[PDB]
Structure 1
């Protein structure tokens, strides 16, 4: 294995000035503020995340480890961490929030072009993680953030595991994974591969095409395992042609090797992105268009590279 020569940058608490809370849950809270490097005359919109026990600090550093070892336009990169007491994770701010809540609140303005483009960008990000031998194990619309309506990034590496040079699959033992996005072999045998992420990709695409619906809605998670064995899958969304829907089905095959690779998914959706109204039928597809005081020195984190 190649030596991971990534750089973990330790940030001072006096550098950034937090504002408000983006969200709060049982997992933790997410803040927002402006990271201002020491005398560099730049202000960077960032998102501060915290999950106060030794158990909490260990798991949050594992995520920080992975997040600081990725460098792709469609993957959230860790900017640095702040040693406070509870460790904070500082990352680039994604103003439009997660993609799931985005499509639910803009379904009457989202065209086929945006939908197919998102599917390409997600597949590009996932393919990158496959190159880094990283298995996400938690791919969903909620785990996809929106920088701009035409640029999304993958995230949440709280379950991401790295495979060795001679390792093909990962074995779990915890019990905190969303069943409705998991592959069949993952539910039954705790086996996680890159092709198990393909299943999650298929469900993720289904979420987007249904404009943010709940997969297997009205069905308990303890019954999902038995249902998949019967051969039952998610239905075909109204806007989807058989071309798009068949791709999802391929991601839901029993044989993991029969499932498409991410690099193949990139090509397929890219072809459809050239003529989006041929593969996605949406009513009024044409007439749809998605959109402080002292902020002249504000620079996006993507334009601020490592000094």
Structure 2
């Protein structure tokens, strides 16, 4: 995978898919000059660094090549930075599980857990700390295949860096590890905490974590030992994996490689681990 530099004339926006503080994502079409091939894409237009700095950030971004992480296909630099990325036709997984909650079985849920762990393990191998894992940031290529994406919070660790020490950026408190909330420290193991919350979101068909509770009260609740409750469909074996992801000692949490193994085992006999009516 390599980075392509695109001219504005190579692609067109068709419609808005979503927006946020990061900018706007459009559904789009890309036709590389003279290639005659039409490629459906998602165009992320970001809301200034030197062009060379931006391209260097994009070159590393384009080198991220894994079945469960969204890839950057090209970039266009004008008055704005536009990132041309793989299009995920079905949108964010959070909305997907909310919409299809009546028709989702144990096989799909556990397969998604495996895939997300595989994507995160790949990011860890690349020394990337994600810092924003949540069901809203997992996207659906097909019902059977999901991919993680990033909207600016991910950081690359240097060879000697074991953690990222954050500054003043706004934080998704309810998905964060306690050490991140208290000390602005982020590691692959704090990503594991966020993975646990993401799995809880999936198993509750997209329910809100610490629902109705002010973000400012979360660290105090976690310090008292309280955690998100066992989802109705979860056997205790699955809930205990979640609970391991939220242990106070980051080093005692499972690593993504371990999570791949454990959820893969469960995915082999899905109805043994998640209890869903009509499944099947």
Bin of the TM-score, shorter chain as denominator length: over 0.9
Secondary structure of 1:240 counterpart: coil
Quote the offset at 1:8 in angstroms.
2.8
Quote the offset at 1:26 in angstroms.
3.7
Q: 1:213 to 1:64 in 2, by over 3 A?
A: farther
8 A contact 1:36–1:42 mirrored in 2: yes
8 A contact 1:63–1:157 mirrored in 2: no
Distance 2:228 2:51 in 1: 38
Quote the offset at 1:50 in angstroms.
1.3
RMSD: 3.3
Q: 1:238 to 1:58 in 2, by over 3 A?
A: farther
Q: 1:125 to 1:58 in 2, by over 3 A?
A: same
Query: Is 265-274 or 59-68 further displaced after alignment?
Result: 59-68
Quote the offset at 1:135 in angstroms.
0.5
Quote the offset at 1:59 in angstroms.
10
Distance 1:233 1:211 in 2: 18
Instruction: Name the structure, 1 or 2, with higher relative contact order (CA <8 Å, separation 6+).
Output: 1
Q: 1:214 to 1:58 in 2, by over 3 A?
A: farther
Distance 1:23 1:44 in 2: 20
Secondary structure of 2:132 counterpart: coil
Structure with more helix by fraction: 2
Q: How many residues get paired?
A: 279
Q: Which position in structure 1 is the counterpart of 2:255?
A: 261
Q: Which position in structure 1 is the counterpart of 2:11?
A: 16
Q: TM-score, normalised by structure 1?
A: 0.86
Q: 1:26 to 1:157 in 2, by over 3 A?
A: closer
Q: Which position in structure 1 is the counterpart of 2:75?
A: 81
Quote the offset at 1:38 in angstroms.
1.9
Q: 1:21 to 1:58 in 2, by over 3 A?
A: farther
Q: 1:167 to 1:25 in 2, by over 3 A?
A: closer
Secondary structure of 1:81 counterpart: strand
Q: Which position in structure 2 is the counterpart of 1:236?
A: 230
8 A contact 1:72–1:128 mirrored in 2: yes
Distance 2:227 2:50 in 1: 36
Distance 2:53 2:24 in 1: 15
Distance 1:58 1:283 in 2: 55
Secondary structure of 1:222 counterpart: helix
8 A contact 2:2–2:59 mirrored in 1: no
Distance 2:49 2:36 in 1: 38
Provide, for residues 113-162 of structure 1, a one-character-per-residue CA deviation record: whole Å limited to 9, x for no partner: 00000000000000001101110011010110100000100001411111
Quote the offset at 1:233 in angstroms.
0.2
8 A contact 2:138–2:149 mirrored in 1: yes
Provide, for residues 210-262 of structure 1, a one-character-per-residue CA deviation record: whole Å limited to 9, x for no partner: 00001000100000010000000000000000000000000000111100010
Q: Which position in structure 1 is the counterpart of 2:126?
A: 132
Distance 1:99 1:176 in 2: 23
8 A contact 2:30–2:40 mirrored in 1: yes
Query: Is 154-163 or 212-221 further displaced after alignment?
Result: 154-163
Quote the offset at 1:185 in angstroms.
0.5
8 A contact 2:40–2:87 mirrored in 1: yes
Quote the offset at 1:60 in angstroms.
7.5
8 A contact 1:67–1:76 mirrored in 2: no
Q: 1:23 to 1:62 in 2, by over 3 A?
A: farther
Distance 2:60 2:154 in 1: 8
Query: Is 201-210 or 7-16 further displaced after alignment?
Result: 7-16
- Unmatched tracts of structure 2, length 5 or more: none
Q: TM-score, normalised by structure 2?
A: 0.94
Q: 1:118 to 1:124 in 2, by over 3 A?
A: same
Q: Which position in structure 2 is the counterpart of 1:181?
A: 175
Query: Is 166-175 or 65-74 further displaced after alignment?
Result: 65-74
8 A contact 1:171–1:190 mirrored in 2: yes
Quote the offset at 1:205 in angstroms.
0.1
